[PDB]
């Protein structure tokens, strides 16, 4: 998962 | 190997073996699949299946760009899907053409998930979930054991994630035992990154996948909700499959407890592996120890008996957990990257991976004997600007 899925 | 057996065209006609029609365990019509490795499949189609809160194509809600992105039309065509299907190919010549990605690509190869799915616990038996249905010529379906499905994005194109099915009583992906791992990811798109002027490689993106399925292929993924505050709370999962910069966000002592944790696991199926009376399926008991003793590096004595050797198990799970990172892999493919996890993407990009003048499986973007070789111009979206179409 790209960092945009932690938010 | 020289890792992809053949090029395949989406159009190319089935034959039951490395194309046909399959389903994945949902009911569903089937679809065209590729196998393009032992144990690897592509379906180059909008993952509408894998999940029942998502068999649609853009929410009330939705995020915008460059966080997610939408467009129902993507990947509806023939040639879109030839062109998907080349593209993830290129991606895994070029993951495979670096000696890490060759090892990480064996890795996962052999990461076949265990065959715990019987309530006997002196029968070996396969989990449904862990395979694909393929069509046969009467119309029958054969069950198919796959290590990796790489897969189209569902609604949101630029969501891409590794998933795979659940079980009623196991937790597949943290208990040794690992699943098959659905990849949603798209060669068609990719990010512009701090400082957003450059593009990130796709082959750098899929890696970062393939290590997540990597994780989950060996039971050895860390849950979600195991987080770290950063500064902000990231997943410990996420934070250690980037590694590099971010390793130093890492609790090194939960780091070790769940190092002696897999070992134990390891050798729960280790122990199970010599309990084993019978199997189910067609080869083979002993066929399936000797496949399981290779993918946890099981020793063998002479009785034949199964134990965790200690030497091996620490440099298959460091292996795993800190030598393949997205952070390594840039080193490898010599690209221009964020050097943290914590990274906003600040745009995206419709590209074309597929013309050998446009990324080549040794260069990516950066092609050797063009303007584009020196100082990432390839990935520069400004000098480069016929290869990138910056979003919404
Ligand atoms: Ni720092
Ligand atoms: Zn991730």
Known sequence: ?7 | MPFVNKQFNYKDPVNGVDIAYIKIPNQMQPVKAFKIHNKIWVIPERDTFTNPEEGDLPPPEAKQVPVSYYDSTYLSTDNEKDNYLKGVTKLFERIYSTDLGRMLLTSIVRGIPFWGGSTIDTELKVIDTNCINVIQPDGSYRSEELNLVIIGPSADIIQFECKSFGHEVLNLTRNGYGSTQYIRFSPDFTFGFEEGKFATDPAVTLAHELIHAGHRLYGIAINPNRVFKVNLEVSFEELRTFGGHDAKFIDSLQENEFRLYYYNKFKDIASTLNKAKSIVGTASLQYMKNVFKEKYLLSEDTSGKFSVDKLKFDKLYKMLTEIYTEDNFVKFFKVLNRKTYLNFDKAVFKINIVPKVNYTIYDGFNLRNTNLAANFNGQNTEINNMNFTKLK
């Open chain 1, 1 to 7: 998962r790209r960092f945009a899925a932690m938010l």
